[PDB]
Design a protein around this ligand. Structure first.
Ligand SMILES: OC[C@H]1O[C@@H](O[C@@H]2[C@H](O)[C@@H](O)[C@H](O)O[C@@H]2CO)[C@H](O)[C@@H](O)[C@H]1O
Ligand SMILES: [Ca+2]
Ligand SMILES: [Ca+2]
Length: 109
């Protein structure tokens, strides 16, 4: 099961973890350019991309992921617990942004 994450940070210290069924597959430190990050698992289950090290000046943007060849846009996902929206952390879904610690759920593998 191949999973590619296309993502960037605002300052390049930002850390994201790819999780599958509650298991952490891989963790990466992002750069300020949108770039691809790839991982693989034999596991199935819910995919999450989690921003874990929010601090003054850090924000994550996930464009999309690609799961076994199939594109899933971050902005088409309904659960986003880190976006700043409606004047609060995790204030909406359907966003590329994780401003606060939180994750975007991309559903089952
Ligand atoms: O509430 C603390 C929270 O704020 C975040 O920033 C939001 C928003 O993302 C910015 O665009 C806006 O300029 O400022 C607000 C808060 O005033 C932030 O990204 C988080 O890391 C938290 O600190
Ligand atoms: Ca996108
Ligand atoms: Ca932030």
């Amino acid at each position: 099961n191949s999973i590619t994450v296309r993502a960037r940070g605002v300052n390049g210290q930002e850390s994201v973890s790819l999780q599958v069924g509650g298991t952490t597959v891989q963790t990466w430190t992002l750069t300020t350019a949108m770039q691809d990050y790839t991982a693989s698992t034999s596991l199935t289950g819910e995919i999450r991309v989690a921003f874990t090290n929010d601090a003054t000046g850090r924000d994550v943007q996930v464009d999309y992921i690609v799961v076994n060849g199939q594109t899933r846009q971050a902005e088409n996902q309904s659960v986003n617990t880190g976006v700043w929206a409606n004047n609060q952390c995790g204030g909406s879904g359907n966003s590329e942004w994780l401003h606060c610690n939180g994750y975007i759920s991309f559903g089952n593998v």
